[PDB]
């Protein structure tokens, strides 16, 4: 419970998002503690009840955990990229067959098994634990790969990576931000304060990058 | 020369008429036909329906003949009578929401994809929004419904939400676009995206 608040929060929240829920929770809880894991692991260390964690952010769904709860605490954008020479933007046109016939690089579970939300398409796949090293590979020509905004702003600009997806949704891919919190939570009023403010100042935050 | 365009009913008025008004910038013949989501996908699929784009909210990956595109997005609510039982405590988890009974769209056949398919065991099937609703109001389950098939009547106070702690301003569903894959050359329709991607947007920010 609130005694050691212990958030977990995946990799593909980006910072901005991170550092904000980080704000609220200091200002209405009083011991805070952040984990963090790829989006593939977010839901299976919860669940180790040996984990003993609290609150968790990540764009992965399950539709109903043992322990847990489930909001939606904002939004974030992600990008089918690729290397600008890889053949897919040859093609000037997409769907996700045309993808499916390249080698995805994908993230992984420690587990091996995948939800629905990161499933590969693909049949030629490949598998990586992060997404510095997803993008390795992508960077050296070897494959596509889905991965956050804030991971691949700078080298799309630099022309060293390559977008799939503008066509399929101008702007990013819209991934819902899912808040998992523990029933001991649900009475507290400072976690629904900090429901309040979060989703406030995301929203604030998010509508800000149209200026 | 028939683009046959397929629009479920949870696609809200404005955007169907949205869609209408800039097809018609480019396009002679135009041929609307409206779906409940729950079969969608299916009348698509379905070889002769010869259906050039189809506009709904349910979701696969792969489809035969069809590219895939997104839309825009729409709002969408956990309604239920204000006595309900649920209304009166606060709903934290879809756990207390599966141990009553759903209202929800039947599918034609039985089948339905992962968005549409039901929360509880305890489900009644129904063909439209107006047939749920009538339900949830005499008090029989909660339902998800589009926002404009609610809006009114939650002011009335015939009607509760429940999503509004999940999701505030309302469950964020995304509207697909999928097109036979003649279209995907034709300016025509690389236009209809731009300018109705364009004028959607306009149109949902409009709320505030
Ligand atoms: O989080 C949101 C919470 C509420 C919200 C409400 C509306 S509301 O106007 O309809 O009430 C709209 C939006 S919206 O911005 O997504 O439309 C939101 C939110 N979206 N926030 C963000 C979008 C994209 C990015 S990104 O850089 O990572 O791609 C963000 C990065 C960091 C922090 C927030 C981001
Ligand atoms: O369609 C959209 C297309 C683009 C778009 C871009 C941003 S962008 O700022 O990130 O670039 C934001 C948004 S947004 O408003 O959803 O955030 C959109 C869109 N959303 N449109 C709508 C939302 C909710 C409702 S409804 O509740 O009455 O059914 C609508 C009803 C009719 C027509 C459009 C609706
Ligand atoms: F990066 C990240 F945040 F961790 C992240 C976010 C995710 N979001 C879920 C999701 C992924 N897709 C999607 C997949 C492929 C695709 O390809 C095309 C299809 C048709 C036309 C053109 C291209 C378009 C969309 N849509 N939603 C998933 C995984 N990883
Ligand atoms: F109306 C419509 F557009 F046709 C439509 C849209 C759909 N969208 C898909 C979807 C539905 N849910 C969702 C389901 C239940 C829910 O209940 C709670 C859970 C936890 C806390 C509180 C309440 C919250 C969210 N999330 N995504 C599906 C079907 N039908
Ligand atoms: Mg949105």
């Given at each position: 419970?609130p ?15 991170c ?7 200091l200002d209405?809880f009083?011991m ?6 790829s989006?593939a692991?977010?839901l299976?260390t ?8 609290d609150?968790?952010?990540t764009?992965?769904?399950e ?5 847990f ?10 990008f089918?990229?690729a290397?600008?020479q890889?053949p ?5 046109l997409?769907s996700?067959?045309?993808?499916a016939?390249?080698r995805?690089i994908?993230?992984g579970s420690?587990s091996g098994?995948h939800?629905?939300?990161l ?9 990586v634990?992060?997404?510095d090293?997803?993008?390795r590979?992508?960077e050296?020509?070897?494959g ?11 080298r799309?600009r630099?022309?060293?990576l390559?977008?799939?997806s ?8 819209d991934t819902k931000?899912?808040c998992?919190?523990?029933?001991a939570?649900?009475?507290e009023?400072?976690?629904l ?9 995301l ?5 800000q990058?149209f200026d």
């Open positions: 419970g005694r050691n608040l212990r958030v977990l929060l995946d990799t593909a929240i980006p910072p901005s998002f550092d904000t829920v980080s704000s609220v929770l209405d009083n805070v503690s952040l984990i963090r894991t989006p692991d977010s299976a919860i669940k180790q009840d040996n984990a003993e964690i609150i968790a952010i764009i992965d769904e539709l109903k955990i043992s322990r709860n489930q909001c939606v605490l904002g939004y974030t954008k992600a089918v990229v290397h600008p890889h897919l933007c040859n093609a000037s997409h996700i067959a045309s993808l016939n390249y995805q994908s993230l420690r098994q939800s629905n939300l499933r590969p398409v693909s049949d030629k796949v490949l598998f634990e992060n997404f090293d997803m993008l590979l992508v050296a020509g070897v596509w790969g889905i991965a956050p905004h804030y991971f691949v702003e700078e799309l630099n022309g060293t390559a977008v799939l503008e066509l399929y949704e101008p702007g990013g891919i931000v899912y998992y919190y523990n029933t939570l649900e009475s009023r400072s976690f304060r900090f429901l309040e403010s979060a989703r406030q100042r929203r604030e935050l998010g509508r990058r």
